[PDB]
Write a protein that holds these residues in place. Structure first.
Motif, PDB file in Angstrom:
ATOM      1  N   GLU A 126       0.817  -1.271   0.077  1.00  0.00           N
ATOM      2  CA  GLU A 126       0.016   0.189   0.179  1.00  0.00           C
ATOM      3  C   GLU A 126       0.811   1.305   0.000  1.00  0.00           C
ATOM      4  O   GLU A 126       0.502   2.327  -0.112  1.00  0.00           O
ATOM      5  CB  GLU A 126      -0.617  -0.007   1.300  1.00  0.00           C
ATOM      6  N   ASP A 127       2.122   1.022  -0.241  1.00  0.00           N
ATOM      7  CA  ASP A 127       3.153   2.135   0.000  1.00  0.00           C
ATOM      8  C   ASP A 127       3.113   2.655  -1.412  1.00  0.00           C
ATOM      9  O   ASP A 127       4.473   3.798  -1.487  1.00  0.00           O
ATOM     10  CB  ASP A 127       4.298   1.982   0.573  1.00  0.00           C
ATOM     11  N   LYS A 128       2.568   2.409  -2.396  1.00  0.00           N
ATOM     12  CA  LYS A 128       2.940   3.063  -3.729  1.00  0.00           C
ATOM     13  C   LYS A 128       4.101   2.293  -4.355  1.00  0.00           C
ATOM     14  O   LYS A 128       4.307   3.017  -5.218  1.00  0.00           O
ATOM     15  CB  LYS A 128       2.920   4.320  -3.622  1.00  0.00           C
ATOM     16  N   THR A 129       4.562   1.206  -3.974  1.00  0.00           N
ATOM     17  CA  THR A 129       5.683   0.834  -4.572  1.00  0.00           C
ATOM     18  C   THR A 129       5.859  -0.758  -4.864  1.00  0.00           C
ATOM     19  O   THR A 129       5.219  -1.410  -3.931  1.00  0.00           O
ATOM     20  CB  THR A 129       6.985   1.180  -3.531  1.00  0.00           C
ATOM     21  N   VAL A 130       6.450  -1.257  -6.184  1.00  0.00           N
ATOM     22  CA  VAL A 130       6.674  -2.556  -6.396  1.00  0.00           C
ATOM     23  C   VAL A 130       8.215  -2.937  -6.041  1.00  0.00           C
ATOM     24  O   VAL A 130       8.874  -2.434  -6.854  1.00  0.00           O
ATOM     25  CB  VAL A 130       6.291  -2.750  -7.777  1.00  0.00           C
TER      26      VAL A 130
END
Ligand SMILES: [Mg+2]
Lengths: 337, 26
Positions: free
Chosen positions: A92-96
């Motif tokens: 959910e931290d906007k990162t892959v």
RNA sequence: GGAGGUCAACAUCAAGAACUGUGGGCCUUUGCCUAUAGAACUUAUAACGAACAUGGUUCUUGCCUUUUACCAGAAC
């Protein structure tokens, strides 16, 4: 229309065996959001959490191997690679974030989602990543150069679940606008739309063989043929809502996790439901906390692994006695729709 | 004129194909 | 045709202590065994540079209101 109803009475489908509860593994501090299994040796799990960590559990004895930290917020999805020793986790931290299994350190960060990314699926042959989330768009990431090569404009709402396939449509997607799209990535537009779901499609699973997909909704778990994109079958369901996840054994057994805590097992061919179980919540838990967040089968398919909202992973084993003495489940009686 | 009105939708899209014969192989 | 050029392009420069070609035998091209020819440049107190900078991520610290800018070690 009765002719169809006779044609439902000829088959008498597909006996299988029941399931039961082999093992309970506590040890997460928060919820367990996602689970994936080593595609080669079947020796372990990677399990997300709501505590941001990842705890790699041994499949054999259930012991805890290692802890992989490094996300600041909850981990919605985790996927392990076949041809690569890589582990792609997403949150959910906007990162892959990539993970090099060898040395266990973050290698790469992929950038440019607007908001939390709730699905990663690793394209089998192309060295691609497919990510999706509240963006309402599917991003095809080039694994090597970290370039969001393709963006797929698309569903009118968030994208819950995404899968990858070697031939045409190479990406199947499911969204809270209650549709499922079958994508053609090279041209970059929808190949086929499947609207038959009445609410958010929260989970899909690819049948390991027949080249089809099982799509979920609140009360009705349907199936879909890929390629042409027809409906194939339906699955008989009274209200099971909500269906959090699906998993497909190599024996054509179709698992359905409930939010009411009920485990709805199906045959894949028929649509028949031969078993429904109920988990025991926990020592101090609440009756609301009993549900099934994720689930998977090993490479063989003779064991089941379900992360639950009660902060525990459970391992469900297929009974060896069974056969015809008394297996029989609900016994294939279907009410008129 | 029946062809023109609803011309897009048609019934056979509602009905599942596997229920005829199980084991029809995809 | 020789000497050069503060000229250019294309190759090659970190590895089983390691290169390439070729002859012959087995498996069925790969690969293994055997025979033979040639190996520039770089390497043992290890390396193209007898020199010596910066950046990114991840951890450990140090300053210590917060962020850039930073303190000094490690891995990639
Ligand atoms: Mg501020």
């Amino acid at each position: 229309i009765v002719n169809r109803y006779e044609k439902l009475l000829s088959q008498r489908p597909e006996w299988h065996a029941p399931w039961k509860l082999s093992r309970v593994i506590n040890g997460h501090l928060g919820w367990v959001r996602c689970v994936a299994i080593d595609p080669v040796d079947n020796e372990w799990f990677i399990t997300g959490s709501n505590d941001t960590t990842m705890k790699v559990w041994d499949l054999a004895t259930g012991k805890l191997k290692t802890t992989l930290a490094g996300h600041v917020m909850t981990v919605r999805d985790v996927a392990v690679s076949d041809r690569h020793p890589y582990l792609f986790s997403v949150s959910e931290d906007k990162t892959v974030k990539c993970w090099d299994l060898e040395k266990n350190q973050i290698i790469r960060d992929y950038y440019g989602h607007l908001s939390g990314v709730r699905t990663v699926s690793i394209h089998p042959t192309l060295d691609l990543i497919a990510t999706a989330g509240r963006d309402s768009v599917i991003k095809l990431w080039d694994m090597r150069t970290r370039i969001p090569v393709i963006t797929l404009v698309g569903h009118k709402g968030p994208i819950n679940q995404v899968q990858c396939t070697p031939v045409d449509p190479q990406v199947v997607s499911s969204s809270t606008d209650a549709t499922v799209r079958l994508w053609d990535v090279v041209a970059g537009k929808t190949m086929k739309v499947l609207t038959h779901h009445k609410r958010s499609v929260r989970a899909t699973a690819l049948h390991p063989k027949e080249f089809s997909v099982a799509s979920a909704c609140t009360d009705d778990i349907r199936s879909w043929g890929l390629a042409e994109g027809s409906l194939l079958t339906n699955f008989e369901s009274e209200k099971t809502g909500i269906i959090n996840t699906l998993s497909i054994n190599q024996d054509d057994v179709l698992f359905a996790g409930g939010d009411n805590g009920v485990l709805s097992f199906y045959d894949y061919k028929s649509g028949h439901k031969y078993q429904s179980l109920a988990t025991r919540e926990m020592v101090g838990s609440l009756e609301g906390e009993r549900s099934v967040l994720c689930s998977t089968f090993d490479k063989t398919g003779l064991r089941l692994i379900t992360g639950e909202a009660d902060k525990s992973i459970k391992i469900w084993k297929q009974d060896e006695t069974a056969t015809k003495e008394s297996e029989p489940g609900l016994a294939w009686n279907p009410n008129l729709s | 004129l029946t062809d023109q009105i609803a011309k897009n939708v048609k019934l056979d899209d509602f009905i599942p194909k596997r229920q005829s014969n199980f084991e029809l192989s995809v």
